[PDB]
Amino acid sequence: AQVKVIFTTTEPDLELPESKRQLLVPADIRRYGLSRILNSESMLDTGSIPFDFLINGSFLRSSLEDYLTSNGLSLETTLTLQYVRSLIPPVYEASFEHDDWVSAVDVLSATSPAGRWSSAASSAAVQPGQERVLSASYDGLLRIWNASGSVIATSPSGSHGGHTASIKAAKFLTSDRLASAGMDRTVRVWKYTESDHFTGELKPTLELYGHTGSVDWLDVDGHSKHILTASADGAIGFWSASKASAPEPDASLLPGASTAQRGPLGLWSIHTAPATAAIFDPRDRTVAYSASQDHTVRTLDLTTGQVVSTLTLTHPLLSLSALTTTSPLLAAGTSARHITMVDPRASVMTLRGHANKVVSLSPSPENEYSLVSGSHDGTCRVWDLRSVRPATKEEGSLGGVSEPVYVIERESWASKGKKKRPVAGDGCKVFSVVWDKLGIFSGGEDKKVQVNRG
Amino acid sequence: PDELKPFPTVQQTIFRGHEGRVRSVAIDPTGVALATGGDDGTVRVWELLTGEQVWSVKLNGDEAVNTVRWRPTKDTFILAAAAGEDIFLMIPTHPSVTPALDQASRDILNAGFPPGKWARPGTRLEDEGVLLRITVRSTIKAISWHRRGDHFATVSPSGQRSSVAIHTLSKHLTQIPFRKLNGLAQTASFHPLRPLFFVATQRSIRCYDLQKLELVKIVQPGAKWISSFDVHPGGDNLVVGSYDKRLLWHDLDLSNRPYKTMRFHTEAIRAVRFHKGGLPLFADASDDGSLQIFHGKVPNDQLENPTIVPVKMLKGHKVVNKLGVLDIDWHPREPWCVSAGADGTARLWM
Ligand SMILES: [Cl-]
Ligand SMILES: [Cl-]
Ligand SMILES: [Cl-]
Ligand SMILES: [Cl-]
Ligand SMILES: [Cl-]
């Protein structure tokens, strides 16, 4: 019945002056009573916010006195409690059926990257009502989906100027323009116009040939109209989405021996093995980051020709993402089933518990410390980097270990009374995950884009 | 565990859509693609990580495709498959194939325009991309490429005539050198470094020399009916496996006797393959759906004890119609492997 607590937080807009100091003393209080104390008219005056509490870097799932009986520590000690916004669980909402596997998902929102990029210029500046969801299929077809899950627009087919084979990745670079890439080695830039009645049109603006190999990954900059790609040739591409400024194509990569065909500006091969992911730096748009099966994450300078830094990891890397200090922190999805959090400057921690390859990542739109990943094991998992344990002995190495906060399964499989997930990824494989405020859309082998939100 | 890492532990990708057993697996020289021959007579090429099938062809209306093997050169992208008596050379449609690489492969196969007869196949086959049909006298079990990809040998067990055939892709030339083998030839392998050759019968494995044309060595594994074998990249060791459930490591530095004998299997061992590309791993495939993954290390110094320990047993293949795992191949760089079982599936392990 007497225990000292002290409140600290990393949360940007929730902070206590002066009141951090003082004693909570039923001593049997679950996280609930504490979340109530913070919400108090006296403390944060917010009053409903669910708060989770981290001691030592671990969540408190019991009462206080139980925690400090079972560990040790019924020392009258002052437990230092980090408090964080408790995750609002992304439960299942909708599913958009496809004919073949869903390789890629992107979300056009008012606050999504293409959405903020839009309102600058050219600019639809998409209204809070109508959000659009892009899906790329092994069909060879892009589909612009309604928020309510109907198909507004469908890409042309092969003939008529569309993709000649499966599409590996696609994204919104603005509300007018969107970009795709695939097994046909092209990178295609599309105009998307929409009518009064809800129906779309996707007209190819540009066919871009630099690559010999599948173009596996694509990232976009809507401000500078730049695209960059990662391909199985072990090479990272850099392109202008604008027809205006482009070089002329290689012509020995073209369908020989209407729509405009242009080449890359600054196509480089920096990798021994296929290049799985390439992304822009959030702060600086002339700096890019590469990841390949050659185990390397490379800091790359797009202004000059090539690589300013190389960082090598234990296992081949299938994916990369940046988390916003003046500069990012990378999540690297591995074929080794875990995610390594990498600091590119001259291996902080490791997220564990995926059962298969980790092929897609995306940061929370809400806070810096949260991340969602997606994986060939049929699930997308939500991590909080503020949740960290000193590494376990087996396979643990340096203490990095962080387990998932929430687990998102396929409603394809989950709706069945079945017990354990299918071996490998069979039928459930998750190829793409994007996390927006609508939130957590998941493409994959089950031919469905899946919507999870609270 | 320990220093024995890494190795395949779990199966990360399942390869489906063959009907009836899958007879063969060969990974693309660049490591981005899988090739599977079927009992349904289809050769197919699949995206390695995802398990999406990007290409397929049916060579013969009714026959099984026993062996598929890539031309071990990264500048070509040429696949060889064996259906019955015929060995087909083809160029699968893949993202890897540009018009330059296509024209290059076509230039290699078309260059060069009876123990064997080299013929252009039916129109329907180049319509689907198969440029060559090479016919030998009796059915082909095994195919092996020489490391620079100009020569390839086909082994046909039944017919003594064509049993071991060495083909030259430049001159379109089938030959039956070192003609009569004293045995029933299961399969054959070229040497990783020096111009040597290997021919395994059910008896024993015999290492020849090509244009000196002489028998160099003969190693006797001392087991019933050798099922298969594979040569260490170092060249100074190899591994044999049999229908006796036993695996035999042969050190050719020391003796014709097997250096080590290993019983990990309930039923016959139908395939054995080393990891070529420098990792201390090899594996055997069994008629129980298990793979047995071993660590073994050809010593840094010549004439030293190879250290061999089993690291992991991979289950999850289904024993179907009396048979287990029928084939194995390894990724070129990474410690991943792919197996061909009778499930009608191929499976990726990491
Ligand atoms: Cl033009
Ligand atoms: Cl799990
Ligand atoms: Cl097909
Ligand atoms: Cl025919
Ligand atoms: Cl199965």
From Swiss-Prot, chain A:
Protein's organism: Chaetomium thermophilum (strain DSM 1495 / CBS 144.50 / IMI 039719) (Thermochaetoides thermophila)
Function, as annotated: Component of the NOP7 complex, which is required for maturation of the 25S and 5.8S ribosomal RNAs and formation of the 60S ribosome.
HAMAP family hit by this protein: WDR12 (MF_03029)
Placement of WD repeats on the sequence: 117-155, 162-200, 210-249, 251-270, 271-312, 353-393, 425-454
Compartments in which it is found: Nucleus, Nucleolus; Nucleus, Nucleoplasm
Subunit structure: Component of the NOP7 complex, composed of ERB1, NOP7 and YTM1. The complex is held together by ERB1, which interacts with NOP7 via its N-terminal domain and with YTM1 via a high-affinity interaction between the seven-bladed beta-propeller domains of the 2 proteins. The NOP7 complex associates with the 66S pre-ribosome. Interacts (via UBL domain) with MDN1 (via VWFA/MIDAS domain).
Protein name: Ribosome biogenesis protein YTM1
An example Gene Ontology molecular-function term: ribonucleoprotein complex binding
Region described as Ubiquitin-like (UBL) domain: 3-85
GO biological process, one term: maturation of LSU-rRNA from tricistronic rRNA transcript (SSU-rRNA, 5.8S rRNA, LSU-rRNA)
Alphabetically ordered keywords of this record: Nucleus, Repeat, Ribosome biogenesis, rRNA processing, WD repeat
Gene Ontology cellular component annotations, sorted alphabetically: nucleoplasm; PeBoW complex; preribosome, large subunit precursor
Family recorded in the similarity comment: Belongs to the WD repeat WDR12/YTM1 family.
Swiss-Prot record, chain B:
Compartments it resides in: Nucleus, Nucleolus; Nucleus, Nucleoplasm
Task performed by this protein: Component of the NOP7 complex, which is required for maturation of the 25S and 5.8S ribosomal RNAs and formation of the 60S ribosome.
Family indicated by similarity: Belongs to the WD repeat BOP1/ERB1 family.
WD repeat ranges, renumbered to this chain: 17-56, 60-100, 135-177, 180-218, 221-260, 264-304, 320-350
Subunit-level organization: Component of the NOP7 complex, composed of ERB1, NOP7 and YTM1. The complex is held together by ERB1, which interacts with NOP7 via its N-terminal domain and with YTM1 via a high-affinity interaction between the seven-bladed beta-propeller domains of the 2 proteins. The NOP7 complex associates with the 66S pre-ribosome.
Whole sequence portion shown: 435 to 801 of 801
Name of the protein: Ribosome biogenesis protein ERB1
Species, as recorded: Chaetomium thermophilum (strain DSM 1495 / CBS 144.50 / IMI 039719) (Thermochaetoides thermophila)
